[PDB]
Amino acid sequence: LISKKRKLVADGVFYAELNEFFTRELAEEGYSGVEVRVTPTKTEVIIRATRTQDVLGENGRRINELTLLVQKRFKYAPGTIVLYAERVQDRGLSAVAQAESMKFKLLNGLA
């Protein structure tokens, strides 16, 4: 029961907060953006990264952690929010990923 203007700016702010959370949390895993597809029966959140194995962790442990964090923060019901992970196509054609690689190299001490 909200106007469409505020509905859509809320969608945008949600996408932005998610992007910032993930680019702070999964920086060591090649986080190269996120998509948000709302639907009947759920909203799904498609992360696009490189180290999908490390995003998943063991038994999807970290995915469960992130689903729970998102749900608790954004007041979703358990089951109405889902997270998927995908190996991003064209890793070289992603600026955020190469910038994070530069960051980690310069921090490890490379020239």
Partner 1 sequence: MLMPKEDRNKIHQYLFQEGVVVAKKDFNQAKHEEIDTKNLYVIKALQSLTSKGYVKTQFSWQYYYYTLTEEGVEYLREYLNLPEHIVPGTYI
Partner 2 sequence: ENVWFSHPRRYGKGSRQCRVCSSHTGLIRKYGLNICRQCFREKANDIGFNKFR
Partner 3 sequence: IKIRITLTSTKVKQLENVSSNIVKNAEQHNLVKKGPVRLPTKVLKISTRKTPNGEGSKTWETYEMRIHKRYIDLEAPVQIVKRITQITIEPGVDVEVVVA
In single-letter form, the type of residue at position 77 comes to A
Q: Is 3 in the site for RNA (CB under 7 A)?
A: yes
In the region spanning residues 78 to 107, those forming contacts with partner 1, defined by CB under 8 A, are none
The Cα–Cα gap between 71 and 43 comes to 11
By rule CB under 8 A, what string of x and - marks binding of each residue 1-40 to partner 1? Answer: ----------------x--xx--xx---------------
Task: Give the nearest distance from C-beta 5 to partner 1 in angstroms.
Answer: 22
Partner from partner 3, RNA, partner 1, none binding residue 36, C-beta < 5-8 Å depending on class: partner 3
First to last CA, the chain: 55
